[PDB]
Structure 1
Amino acid sequence: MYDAIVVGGGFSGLKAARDLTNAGKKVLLLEGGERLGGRAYSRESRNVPGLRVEIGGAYLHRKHHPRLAAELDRYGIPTAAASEFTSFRHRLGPTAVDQAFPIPGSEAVAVEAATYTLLRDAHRIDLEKGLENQDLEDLDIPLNEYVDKLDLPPVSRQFLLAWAWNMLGQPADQASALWMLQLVAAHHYSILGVVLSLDEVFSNGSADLVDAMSQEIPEIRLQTVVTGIDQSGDVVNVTVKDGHAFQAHSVIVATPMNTWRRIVFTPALPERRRSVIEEGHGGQGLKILIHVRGAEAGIECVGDGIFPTLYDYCEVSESERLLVAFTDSGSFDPTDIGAVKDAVLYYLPEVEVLGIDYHDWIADPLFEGPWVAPRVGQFSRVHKELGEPAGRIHFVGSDVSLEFPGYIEGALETAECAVNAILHS
């Protein structure tokens, strides 16, 4: 038997397992899939042989993400600036300016006033307390309704909505205004910071860090899917799909939130958590890598398209590039290549789409979703508690971070907290 069993081998599980190991604990890491990294997934491009791409998480910012910064420094993992935006091809109407910040002077006063309203609302959020413990229910409304109340002129209105669509991976009518404000708060109460934190990338892929961390974990079982966690006895019993059970004093659930409903917990998780766990979060983010010909370097497009954003990702050759589009899987079907061409051509009518690459995170049984985004009404009911221990079972991961939800930093933050909690007990 083990001191701790960590379930899930993404950054959260990896940090938890490594730090407990170095603290002298006997740890077993159970990973359901054939690889480590989870939603950090670098691999060879489906479109360009020999080209490594990020199919999940890619972007980081050292100042917004200090734990991640420490990991990179620890293993000497090289980072590079993310692709620079130099050519702006927005779809924000005839008054937009072709810059990264496309707001014209005629909208400046309106933007100034909305910024105050937005930041005032975000400042209501204390990041330690949980979104359910702060009387924030009035803000937990559909984002389109919240934005309607800001009464923004067309360029700034669509610019905000486009980035919010990108960021939350939800259309405006499904996104929670409160969650948008949570992201603003998480970035040091900055609206700008939400986009400006797309600062750097792993030079050699996120697998660089995954591998560096996994090397310090002595016992890892791949292709081992946990189906049950039973703490009714003195020692927690962890049952697997097609294998013998494992036992530990403590268990860290470091699997995606939308997969918890598939695990049989004994006894049942606290009542307050059950409904949201059953439902799952409403995150439907879809990141599509688009292999193109005819695109100039440094393109950024933001607009009212079915792709709210489309921007430069990678130079392939002098004539070919990868662009990246963010949308959501509820609104867009990436198996419809005709739809992809139309979505790209809307912004870039001169460009030829050669192929696309993505992972359907929502269809993957080890994930059942991309990054976290609550449905309207979910997180003002229960939020902090989703990441709280249930007896000897700890819950970690980006999905439950109060400080950096939906980011790699959040996976590392939550793992830190679980590790500290276990070492004090």
Structure 2
Amino acid sequence: MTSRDGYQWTPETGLTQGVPSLGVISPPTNIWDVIVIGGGYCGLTATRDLTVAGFKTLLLEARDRIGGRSWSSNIDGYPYEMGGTWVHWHQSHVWREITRYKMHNALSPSFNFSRGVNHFQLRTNPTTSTYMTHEAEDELLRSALHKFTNVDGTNGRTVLPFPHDMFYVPEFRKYDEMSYSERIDQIRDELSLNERSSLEAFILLCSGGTLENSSFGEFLHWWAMSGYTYQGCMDCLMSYKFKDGQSAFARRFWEEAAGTGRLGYVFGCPVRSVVNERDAARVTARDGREFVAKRVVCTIPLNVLSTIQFSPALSTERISAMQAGHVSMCTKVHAEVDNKDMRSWTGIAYPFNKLCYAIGDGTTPAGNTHLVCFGTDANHIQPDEDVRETLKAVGQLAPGTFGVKRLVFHNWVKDEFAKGAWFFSRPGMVSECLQGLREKHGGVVFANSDWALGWRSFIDGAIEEGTRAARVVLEELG
């Protein structure tokens, strides 16, 4: 079935809105111990866990589909990943779900250097290009990232030995309070233009924000989780994806919860308020429908929380977090291109372009190279507003080398049920707000990847929180 989310473009058709996805459900309602608000991976995991354990559970979702910030669209036999894509066995919670659902052998490597141009193209201004082996690329980045992360002599292993517990070493704090910008000023004189351009594009790829509004320490956190090495990051952040797309993975959570016969659900159901009552909680949609359950697991994203009325009011720490917002404003654009040899191309174009990092990520059934392109708040584009400028930004990644057959993207920034992409914090925000984002609220359990402990902001972190949310509810009732 075809979702309301997403955009597609071809030369023949122009820009159309709405694309297919297995995430679309399916019949939109089939209508409690528990209400779960939101059906991304956090909500899916909580719901799966709770229904399997014997609770009647109602899932309320604003969209016409499951998956939230992660979901895929099969177009002409090719899964286009609209948001969260990549997974790895070094990621505990997603991996456990992958193997339990027997999908550990249903993955593809995004990188294929076995034919074609097999180079990295670095663009530091609009006129000119630098070419490089992928090896040389790997090494440009290791060298840059070593300097960026070596605040303690051990690339973070001393100040953050236990990433799950940021205050184990009291001293990590100053790094959470530091911006990318402040860090770079410290190591500046020691970086070439090539190292710095590569480094800035890489760290901003990770934050989706700006040099000034991105927490250095949050990046140290990603680095630490990944093995405190550049190759560790690439393995964990960008190497392996589902062959059948993230939506086939979300479906497995959905099918299991449904198979218990304890699942109620409503889609197209944007929640407007959550009010604690005597021994229960009442959730009301924008259109006035009301639902009641003993406990509510609320998985609305940080950047959307300020749209909801809660009673009692949320705590002071929750309020600051949501008013400030996280900074990831990532624009992600897929491009089906007519250059077959670009399967093995990668490119960084920084800082002049609105898309700054792109990779050949696959080959469609039609035989065309698929490129994925990323842009950040550093030089922002809204990919839907002016196709001409979006195309010009894709092309500038490799001027004069290809024509575009198709674009596919979803706009996360302008999307009212996301308002941003994956979580990334401002300097000081996690230090300050994480405990609060995570604290009790009577009968409401706030659970989201945005405030995970481990792979925070990742599909993994959604699953971690989701599991934690089910466990809390279980303990409180039973």
Question: What is the TM-score with the length of structure 1 in the denominator?
Answer: 0.89
Cα pair distance change 1:233/1:117, threshold 3 Å = same
2:457 paired residue number: 406
Amino acid at match of 2:194: V
Q: How many residues are aligned here? A: 419
Confirm or deny: 8 A CA contact 2:156 2:224 kept in the other structure: no
Q: Which residue of 2 aligns with 1:237?
A: 282
Assess, with a 3 A threshold, how the Cα gap between structure 1 residues 59 and 295 changes in structure 2: closer, same or farther: same
- Residues 397 and 113 (structure 1), Cα distance of their counterparts in 2 relative to 1, 3 Å cut: closer
2:94 paired residue among 61, 64, 68: 68
Q: Does the CA contact (< 8 Å) of 2:210 and 2:377 recur in 1? A: no
Classify 1:109/1:38 alpha carbon distance in 2 versus 1 (closer, same or farther; 3 Å): closer
**From 413, 416, 422, the counterpart of 2:467:** 416
Distance 1:381 1:16, change over 3 A: same
Are residue 308 (structure 1) and residue 343 (structure 2) matched?
Answer: no
Alignment-derived partner of residue 348 in structure 1: 398
* Cα drift, residue 27 of structure 1: 1.2
1:22-421 alignment, distance < 5 Å: 22-45=52-75, 49-62=76-89, 64-77=90-103, 78-86=105-113, 87-91=118-122, 97-102=132-137, 114-117=148-151, 119-121=154-156, 123-125=158-160, 126-129=162-165, 134=170, 136-139=172-175, 140-151=177-188, 152-197=191-236, 198-217=238-257, 218-296=263-341, 297-305=343-351, 306=353, 307-316=355-364, 320-328=368-376, 331-333=379-381, 334=383, 335-349=385-399, 350-421=401-472
Task: Summarize the Cα distance change of 1:145–1:329 in structure 2 as closer, same or farther, 3 Å threshold.
Answer: closer
Q: Encode CA deviations 1:137-168: one digit per residue, 9 max, x unaligned.
A: 53223212212212323332222211111111
Distance 1:5 1:84 in 2: 41
Residues 113-156 of structure 1: CA deviation (Å, up to 9, x unaligned):
55533754464234334579955453223212212212323332
CA contact (8 A) 1:179 1:373 kept: yes
Cα deviation for residue 31 of structure 1 reads 0.9
Q: Normalising to structure 2: TM-score of the pair? A: 0.80
How far residue 108 of structure 1 moved from its aligned partner, in angstroms, is 8.5
2: CA distance, partners of 1:81 / 1:319: 17
- 2:42 maps to a residue whose letter is S
What code does the residue aligned with 1:162 have? A
Residue pair 1:291, 1:356 contacting (<8 A) in 2 also:
yes
Structure 1 position 74, deviation (Å)? 2.2
Q: Is the 8 A contact 1:229 1:237 kept in 2?
A: yes
C-alpha separation between the residues in 1 aligned to 2:468 and 2:51?
Answer: 15
Are the equivalent residues in 1 in contact too, given 2:122–2:130 (CA < 8 A)? no
For residues 103 and 212 of structure 1, the distance between their equivalents in structure 2, rounded to whole angstroms, comes to 36
Which of 28, 37, 41 lines up with 1:11 in the alignment?
A: 41
State the one-letter code of the partner of 2:120: R
The 1:203/1:111 distance shift into structure 2, 3 A limit, reads closer
Asked if 2 retains the 8 angstrom alpha-carbon contact of 1:232 and 1:267, the reply is no
SS at match of 2:442: coil
Could you tell me which residue of structure 1 aligns to residue 11 of structure 2? none
SS at match of 2:54: coil
Unpaired segments of 5 or more residues in structure 1?
none
Do the aligned partners of residues 141 and 132 (structure 1) sit closer, same or farther apart at CA in structure 2, a change above 3 Å counting? farther
Q: CA RMSD in A?
A: 2.7
- The Cα offsets for residues 337-368 of structure 1, whole Å up to 9 and x where unpaired, read as 44344434444221223342211111111111
Query: In structure 2, how many angstroms separate the alpha carbons of the residues matched to 1:173 and 1:346?
Result: 25
CA distance in 1, matches of 2:145, 2:280: 57
**Cα pair 1:122 1:182 within 8 Å, conserved:** no
Change (3 A) 1:249 1:190: farther
Question: Which sits farther off after the overlay, 352-361 or 266-275?
Answer: 352-361
Residues in 2 aligned to 1:370 and 1:104: alpha-carbon distance in whole angstroms = 29
Equivalent position amino acid for 1:128 in 2: H
**What CA distance in whole angstroms lies between the structure 2 residues aligned with 1:76 and 1:113?**
40
Deviation at 1:56, TM superposition (A): 1.1
Q: Is the 8 A contact 1:96 1:155 kept in 2?
A: no
1:235 offset after TM fit, Å?
1.3
Compared CA separation, residues 133 and 271, structure 1 to 2 (3 A) = farther
Q: Structure 1 234/171 Cα, relative in aligned 2: closer, same or farther at 3 Å?
A: same
The 3-state SS of whatever aligns with 1:5 is: strand
Are the structure 2 counterparts of residues 360 and 28 from structure 1 closer, same or farther at C-alpha, using a change threshold of 3 Å? same
Quote the Cα distance in structure 2 between the aligned partners of 1:257 and 1:288. Answer: 24
Does structure 1 retain, via aligned residues, the 8 Å contact 2:149–2:220? no
Share of identical aligned residues, percent? 25
Q: Give the drift of 1:229.
A: 1.1
Q: Residue type matched to 2:178 in 1?
A: I
Q: Secondary structure at the match of 1:128?
A: coil
